[PDB]
Write a protein that binds this DNA or RNA. Structure first.
Lengths: 106, 97
DNA sequence: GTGAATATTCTAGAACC
DNA sequence: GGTTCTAGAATATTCAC
């Protein structure tokens, strides 16, 4: 009864064997994608019918996830990418009961 | 006077040293991006202030380029006025807004 | 099976730089 | 003008009945 995207996202983020690529941020308030490229080509196709980060991000925004922006505020590197962080008020570590409040947009 | 992006794109596709990643398609009517991930990581920042395929693709669409469908099958984009050996045609390409 | 909801893809709007 | 994040639009595909 819960959309497949949301149940798969929870599993993804929660599952320890994926934590190198996708995991909870340090205070359970958001999830991280640590290695976008290996995530997209190895992890995504095991759960979805694609290997495109763009199509994963589309879904995130569709369910109202928002990217957490980190900027540089200082020195620029240029020698390291990302990582990528997304947040939703009802996608929270050790509160899976909140997931039912997440709603697709249109 | 020509937009940075168009003259940079033209350089990228045309330059033999980059053809492992980005090159004219076989009949000069479109270009191909053969290895999206290395293209983006290693080539894009040599010419632009980023390394995101997505930001490159936003610019392509902004200038009216369109992805060619193909019935990961490499990536192909087309613009009627972006044609191999017809660099004169580039001045006809216009940013959209 | 059929009509809707959802998924995936491609392109564009908007804010910011 | 360029880069980023989010959403519109156009198909595919899946789901609930």
């Amino acid at each position: 009864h819960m959309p497949a995207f949301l149940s798969k996202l929870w599993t993804l983020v929660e599952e320890t064997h994926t934590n190198e690529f996708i995991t909870w941020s340090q205070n359970g308030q958001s999830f991280l994608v640590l290695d976008e490229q290996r995530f997209a080509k190895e992890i995504l196709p095991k759960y979805f019918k694609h290997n495109n980060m763009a199509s994963f991000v589309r879904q995130l925004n569709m369910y109202g996830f928002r990217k957490v922006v980190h900027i540089d505020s200082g020195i620029v590197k240029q020698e390291r990418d990302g990582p990528v962080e997304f947040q939703h008020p009802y996608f929270k570590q050790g509160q899976d009961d909140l997931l039912e409040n997440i709603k697709r947009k249109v």
